[PDB]
Curated annotation (Swiss-Prot), chains A, B:
It comes from Mycobacterium tuberculosis (strain ATCC 25618 / H37Rv). GO terms for cellular component: plasma membrane. SUPFAM superfamilies: Bet v1-like. It comes from the Bacteria. InterPro entries: Polyketide_cyclase/dehydratase, START-like_dom_sf. This is Uncharacterized protein Rv1546.
Amino acid sequence: SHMMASVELSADVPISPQDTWDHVSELSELGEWLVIHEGWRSELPDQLGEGVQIVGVARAMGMRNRVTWRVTKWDPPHEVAMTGSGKGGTKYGVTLTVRPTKGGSALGLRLELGGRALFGPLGSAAARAVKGDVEKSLKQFAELY
Amino acid sequence: SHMMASVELSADVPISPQDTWDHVSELSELGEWLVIHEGWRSELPDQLGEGVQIVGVARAMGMRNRVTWRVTKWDPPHEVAMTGSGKGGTKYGVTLTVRPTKGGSALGLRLELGGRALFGPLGSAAARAVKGDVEKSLKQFAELY
Protein backbone atom coordinates (compact mmCIF):
# COMPACT_ATOMS: atom_id res chain seq x y z
CA SER A 1 0.00 0.00 0.00
CA HIS A 2 2.77 2.44 0.92
CA MET A 3 6.49 2.77 1.60
CA MET A 4 8.19 3.71 4.87
CA ALA A 5 11.53 4.89 6.23
CA SER A 6 12.18 4.06 9.90
CA VAL A 7 14.99 5.28 12.16
CA GLU A 8 15.19 4.23 15.82
CA LEU A 9 17.93 5.66 18.02
CA SER A 10 18.70 5.63 21.73
CA ALA A 11 20.45 8.18 23.93
CA ASP A 12 21.54 7.84 27.56
CA VAL A 13 20.36 10.93 29.44
CA PRO A 14 21.30 11.83 33.04
CA ILE A 15 17.59 12.02 33.87
CA SER A 16 15.63 9.70 36.15
CA PRO A 17 13.21 7.24 34.50
CA GLN A 18 10.11 8.84 36.03
CA ASP A 19 11.31 12.33 35.07
CA THR A 20 12.05 11.25 31.49
CA TRP A 21 8.61 9.62 31.30
CA ASP A 22 6.86 12.68 32.76
CA HIS A 23 8.63 14.75 30.10
CA VAL A 24 7.79 12.51 27.13
CA SER A 25 4.20 12.33 28.44
CA GLU A 26 3.80 16.14 28.57
CA LEU A 27 2.52 16.46 25.02
CA SER A 28 2.01 20.21 25.49
CA GLU A 29 5.82 20.43 25.36
CA LEU A 30 6.36 17.81 22.63
CA GLY A 31 6.89 20.49 19.99
CA GLU A 32 9.78 22.03 21.93
CA TRP A 33 12.20 19.12 21.28
CA LEU A 34 10.60 16.68 18.81
CA VAL A 35 11.51 18.28 15.50
CA ILE A 36 8.74 16.91 13.28
CA HIS A 37 6.02 18.11 15.68
CA GLU A 38 5.05 21.77 15.33
CA GLY A 39 2.00 22.02 17.60
CA TRP A 40 -1.43 20.67 18.49
CA ARG A 41 -4.80 21.55 16.96
CA SER A 42 -7.02 19.84 19.55
CA GLU A 43 -7.09 20.23 23.31
CA LEU A 44 -4.84 17.59 24.78
CA PRO A 45 -6.90 14.83 26.44
CA ASP A 46 -7.37 14.91 30.19
CA GLN A 47 -5.87 11.42 30.54
CA LEU A 48 -3.63 10.20 27.73
CA GLY A 49 -4.50 6.59 26.90
CA GLU A 50 -4.54 4.00 24.15
CA GLY A 51 -7.11 4.81 21.47
CA VAL A 52 -6.96 8.58 22.00
CA GLN A 53 -6.94 10.88 18.95
CA ILE A 54 -5.25 14.28 18.71
CA VAL A 55 -4.88 16.59 15.71
CA GLY A 56 -1.46 18.20 15.28
CA VAL A 57 0.91 19.87 12.83
CA ALA A 58 3.85 17.94 11.39
CA ARG A 59 6.85 19.23 9.44
CA ALA A 60 8.81 16.47 7.70
CA MET A 61 11.29 16.82 4.82
CA GLY A 62 10.21 20.35 3.92
CA MET A 63 6.48 19.56 4.05
CA ARG A 64 3.79 20.63 6.53
CA ASN A 65 0.62 18.68 7.19
CA ARG A 66 -2.33 18.39 9.55
CA VAL A 67 -1.91 14.93 11.09
CA THR A 68 -4.50 12.87 13.00
CA TRP A 69 -2.35 11.16 15.62
CA ARG A 70 -3.74 7.96 17.16
CA VAL A 71 -2.21 6.55 20.35
CA THR A 72 -1.38 2.91 19.59
CA LYS A 73 0.49 2.00 22.80
CA TRP A 74 0.28 3.41 26.34
CA ASP A 75 2.54 1.56 28.84
CA PRO A 76 3.54 4.02 31.57
CA PRO A 77 6.16 4.69 32.60
CA HIS A 78 7.87 2.85 29.73
CA GLU A 79 6.47 3.45 26.24
CA VAL A 80 4.11 5.57 24.17
CA ALA A 81 3.51 4.70 20.52
CA MET A 82 1.59 6.97 18.16
CA THR A 83 0.44 6.58 14.56
CA GLY A 84 -0.62 9.53 12.43
CA SER A 85 -2.14 10.12 9.02
CA GLY A 86 -2.12 13.32 6.98
CA LYS A 87 -3.42 14.84 3.78
CA GLY A 88 -2.10 13.17 0.66
CA GLY A 89 -1.71 9.84 2.45
CA THR A 90 1.32 10.88 4.50
CA LYS A 91 1.90 8.29 7.23
CA TYR A 92 3.79 8.92 10.47
CA GLY A 93 4.86 6.84 13.44
CA VAL A 94 6.49 7.92 16.72
CA THR A 95 7.56 5.49 19.44
CA LEU A 96 9.11 6.86 22.63
CA THR A 97 10.61 4.35 25.07
CA VAL A 98 12.15 4.90 28.51
CA ARG A 99 14.55 2.47 30.19
CA PRO A 100 16.49 2.76 33.47
CA THR A 101 20.27 2.61 32.96
CA LYS A 102 23.50 3.26 34.83
CA GLY A 103 23.68 7.03 35.28
CA GLY A 104 20.06 7.75 34.42
CA SER A 105 17.77 6.71 31.58
CA ALA A 106 17.85 5.50 27.99
CA LEU A 107 15.44 7.44 25.79
CA GLY A 108 14.59 5.63 22.56
CA LEU A 109 12.93 7.48 19.70
CA ARG A 110 11.66 5.56 16.66
CA LEU A 111 10.37 7.68 13.77
CA GLU A 112 8.64 6.31 10.67
CA LEU A 113 7.83 8.52 7.68
CA GLY A 114 6.06 7.39 4.54
CA GLY A 115 3.20 7.68 2.12
CA ARG A 116 2.95 8.78 -1.48
CA ALA A 117 3.58 12.40 -0.48
CA LEU A 118 7.06 11.42 0.71
CA PHE A 119 8.05 8.64 -1.72
CA GLY A 120 6.20 9.60 -4.92
CA PRO A 121 4.01 7.31 -7.01
CA LEU A 122 7.03 5.70 -8.69
CA GLY A 123 9.10 5.30 -5.53
CA SER A 124 6.09 3.84 -3.71
CA ALA A 125 5.75 1.29 -6.53
CA ALA A 126 8.38 -0.89 -4.82
CA ALA A 127 5.58 -2.09 -2.51
CA ARG A 128 3.73 -4.01 -5.24
CA ALA A 129 6.23 -6.88 -4.89
CA VAL A 130 4.67 -7.89 -1.54
CA LYS A 131 1.07 -7.85 -2.81
CA GLY A 132 1.55 -11.35 -4.23
CA ASP A 133 2.50 -12.82 -0.85
CA VAL A 134 -0.28 -10.94 0.95
CA GLU A 135 -3.01 -11.89 -1.52
CA LYS A 136 -1.95 -15.54 -1.73
CA SER A 137 -1.85 -15.79 2.07
CA LEU A 138 -5.33 -14.29 2.41
CA LYS A 139 -6.66 -16.59 -0.32
CA GLN A 140 -5.20 -19.64 1.44
CA PHE A 141 -6.72 -18.44 4.72
CA ALA A 142 -10.16 -18.11 3.15
CA GLU A 143 -9.79 -21.60 1.65
CA LEU A 144 -8.70 -22.89 5.09
CA TYR A 145 -11.51 -21.56 7.31
CA SER B 1 18.24 2.60 10.21
CA HIS B 2 16.26 0.63 7.60
CA MET B 3 13.69 1.04 4.83
CA MET B 4 10.28 -0.66 4.93
CA ALA B 5 7.58 -1.69 2.47
CA SER B 6 4.09 -2.22 3.88
CA VAL B 7 1.14 -3.92 2.16
CA GLU B 8 -2.26 -4.30 3.85
CA LEU B 9 -4.98 -6.35 2.14
CA SER B 10 -8.31 -7.84 3.19
CA ALA B 11 -10.29 -11.01 2.59
CA ASP B 12 -13.87 -11.99 3.41
CA VAL B 13 -14.56 -15.17 5.40
CA PRO B 14 -18.20 -16.42 5.66
CA ILE B 15 -17.83 -17.17 9.39
CA SER B 16 -18.31 -15.24 12.61
CA PRO B 17 -15.62 -12.72 13.64
CA GLN B 18 -14.96 -14.77 16.78
CA ASP B 19 -14.23 -17.83 14.62
CA THR B 20 -11.85 -15.89 12.36
CA TRP B 21 -10.10 -14.45 15.42
CA ASP B 22 -9.73 -17.86 17.07
CA HIS B 23 -8.25 -19.13 13.81
CA VAL B 24 -5.68 -16.34 13.31
CA SER B 25 -4.72 -16.07 16.99
CA GLU B 26 -3.61 -19.73 16.88
CA LEU B 27 -0.15 -18.77 15.65
CA SER B 28 0.81 -22.46 15.73
CA GLU B 29 -1.03 -22.88 12.41
CA LEU B 30 0.36 -19.66 10.91
CA GLY B 31 2.51 -21.75 8.57
CA GLU B 32 -0.61 -23.25 7.00
CA TRP B 33 -1.58 -19.96 5.35
CA LEU B 34 1.00 -17.18 5.82
CA VAL B 35 3.31 -17.77 2.86
CA ILE B 36 6.36 -16.06 4.41
CA HIS B 37 6.17 -18.19 7.59
CA GLU B 38 7.86 -21.59 7.29
CA GLY B 39 7.49 -22.74 10.91
CA TRP B 40 8.67 -22.00 14.43
CA ARG B 41 12.00 -22.85 16.04
CA SER B 42 10.79 -21.95 19.53
CA GLU B 43 7.69 -23.49 21.06
CA LEU B 44 4.83 -21.08 21.62
CA PRO B 45 3.76 -20.34 25.21
CA ASP B 46 0.59 -21.71 26.77
CA GLN B 47 -1.07 -18.37 26.00
CA LEU B 48 -0.02 -15.36 23.94
CA GLY B 49 0.34 -11.73 24.96
CA GLU B 50 2.35 -8.57 24.46
CA GLY B 51 6.08 -9.12 24.91
CA VAL B 52 6.03 -12.81 23.92
CA GLN B 53 9.15 -13.71 21.93
CA ILE B 54 9.38 -16.70 19.58
CA VAL B 55 11.89 -17.75 16.93
CA GLY B 56 10.77 -18.90 13.49
CA VAL B 57 11.79 -19.18 9.86
CA ALA B 58 10.78 -16.74 7.13
CA ARG B 59 11.25 -16.90 3.36
CA ALA B 60 10.67 -13.59 1.59
CA MET B 61 11.86 -12.24 -1.77
CA GLY B 62 13.63 -15.55 -2.37
CA MET B 63 15.64 -15.37 0.86
CA ARG B 64 15.33 -17.75 3.82
CA ASN B 65 16.17 -16.26 7.23
CA ARG B 66 15.84 -17.03 10.94
CA VAL B 67 13.60 -14.42 12.58
CA THR B 68 13.14 -13.53 16.25
CA TRP B 69 9.51 -12.39 16.35
CA ARG B 70 8.12 -10.34 19.24
CA VAL B 71 4.41 -9.75 19.87
CA THR B 72 3.94 -5.97 20.03
CA LYS B 73 0.14 -5.92 20.33
CA TRP B 74 -2.49 -8.37 21.62
CA ASP B 75 -6.09 -7.06 21.47
CA PRO B 76 -8.47 -10.03 21.37
CA PRO B 77 -10.60 -10.59 19.45
CA HIS B 78 -9.59 -7.81 17.05
CA GLU B 79 -5.86 -7.58 16.37
CA VAL B 80 -2.48 -9.22 16.92
CA ALA B 81 0.71 -7.47 15.82
CA MET B 82 4.23 -8.92 15.85
CA THR B 83 7.60 -7.63 14.67
CA GLY B 84 10.62 -9.67 13.61
CA SER B 85 14.23 -8.52 13.60
CA GLY B 86 16.08 -11.24 11.69
CA LYS B 87 19.75 -11.02 10.81
CA GLY B 88 21.36 -9.54 7.76
CA GLY B 89 19.18 -6.48 8.38
CA THR B 90 15.88 -7.98 7.25
CA LYS B 91 12.98 -6.43 9.17
CA TYR B 92 9.52 -8.01 9.31
CA GLY B 93 6.11 -6.96 10.58
CA VAL B 94 2.87 -8.97 10.64
CA THR B 95 -0.43 -7.37 11.64
CA LEU B 96 -3.59 -9.51 11.71
CA THR B 97 -6.89 -7.68 12.18
CA VAL B 98 -10.37 -9.22 12.28
CA ARG B 99 -13.51 -7.20 11.53
CA PRO B 100 -17.17 -8.02 10.83
CA THR B 101 -18.49 -7.68 7.29
CA LYS B 102 -21.48 -8.76 5.20
CA GLY B 103 -21.77 -12.53 5.22
CA GLY B 104 -19.40 -12.94 8.16
CA SER B 105 -16.00 -11.41 8.87
CA ALA B 106 -12.94 -10.00 7.12
CA LEU B 107 -9.33 -10.85 7.86
CA GLY B 108 -6.89 -8.02 7.21
CA LEU B 109 -3.22 -8.89 6.80
CA ARG B 110 -0.53 -6.21 6.81
CA LEU B 111 2.90 -7.51 5.82
CA GLU B 112 5.94 -5.25 6.27
CA LEU B 113 9.29 -6.25 4.75
CA GLY B 114 12.54 -4.34 4.71
CA GLY B 115 16.11 -3.97 5.83
CA ARG B 116 19.34 -3.55 3.92
CA ALA B 117 19.15 -7.14 2.66
CA LEU B 118 15.87 -6.26 0.90
CA PHE B 119 16.53 -2.66 -0.21
CA GLY B 120 20.27 -2.73 -0.93
CA PRO B 121 22.89 -0.32 0.40
CA LEU B 122 21.81 2.47 -1.96
CA GLY B 123 18.07 1.99 -1.51
CA SER B 124 18.47 1.83 2.27
CA ALA B 125 20.18 5.26 2.27
CA ALA B 126 16.80 7.02 2.02
CA ALA B 127 16.39 6.73 5.82
CA ARG B 128 19.49 8.73 6.75
CA ALA B 129 17.50 11.82 5.72
CA VAL B 130 15.29 10.92 8.70
CA LYS B 131 18.08 9.86 11.09
CA GLY B 132 19.17 13.50 11.18
CA ASP B 133 15.83 14.65 12.57
CA VAL B 134 15.81 11.74 15.04
CA GLU B 135 19.28 12.72 16.27
CA LYS B 136 18.32 16.40 16.54
CA SER B 137 15.20 15.51 18.54
CA LEU B 138 17.22 13.38 20.96
CA LYS B 139 19.83 16.12 21.40
CA GLN B 140 17.17 18.78 21.98
CA PHE B 141 15.48 16.56 24.57
CA ALA B 142 18.77 15.96 26.39
CA GLU B 143 19.50 19.70 26.31
CA LEU B 144 16.03 20.86 27.37
CA TYR B 145 15.79 18.74 30.53
